[PDB]
Amino acid sequence: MNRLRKDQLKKLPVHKFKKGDEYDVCAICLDEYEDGDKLRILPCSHAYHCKCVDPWLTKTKKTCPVCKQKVVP
Ligand SMILES: [Zn+2]
Ligand SMILES: [Zn+2]
């Protein structure tokens, strides 16, 4: 169908943001990451806030916005 189910989403890693991380700005909301934020890490290594890309993945496409690769096998 080209979107993810909840149970598929839960298979993707969640990362808590920390100061030394390379992640800097979320390319969907265009806000800086902050010390507690929850990031969704796609298997291609592209990352977003959970709150920003989860609706994308479950209502728009199950492919990475940047590299267009499917996020589940
Ligand atoms: Zn965001
Ligand atoms: Zn990607």
Side-chain angles (χ1 to χ4, degrees):
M1 52 173 157
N2 199 9
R3 75 204 66 106
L4 285 193
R5 296 183 314 264
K6 291 193 177 173
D7 57 288
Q8 290 173 304
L9 180 66
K10 196 146 66 175
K11 297 190 294 202
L12 292 178
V14 172
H15 176 78
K16 248 176 82 180
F17 177 81
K18 291 167 237 56
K19 153 66 183 154
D21 290 338
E22 70 274 31
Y23 313 113
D24 189 42
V25 167
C26 180
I28 289 166
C29 64
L30 299 178
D31 290 338
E32 289 192 300
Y33 295 116
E34 283 172 5
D35 203 79
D37 283 359
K38 285 180 165 209
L39 281 55
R40 184 74 71 184
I41 310 294
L42 303 190
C44 50
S45 73
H46 287 124
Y48 305 84
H49 291 111
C50 293
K51 51 141 188 285
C52 293
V53 72
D54 291 357
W56 161 270
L57 289 172
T58 58
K59 285 153 175 264
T60 306
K61 294 172 181 143
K62 57 173 169 198
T63 56
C64 178
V66 173
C67 67
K68 325 298 173 176
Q69 304 181 27
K70 286 188 188 185
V71 303
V72 296

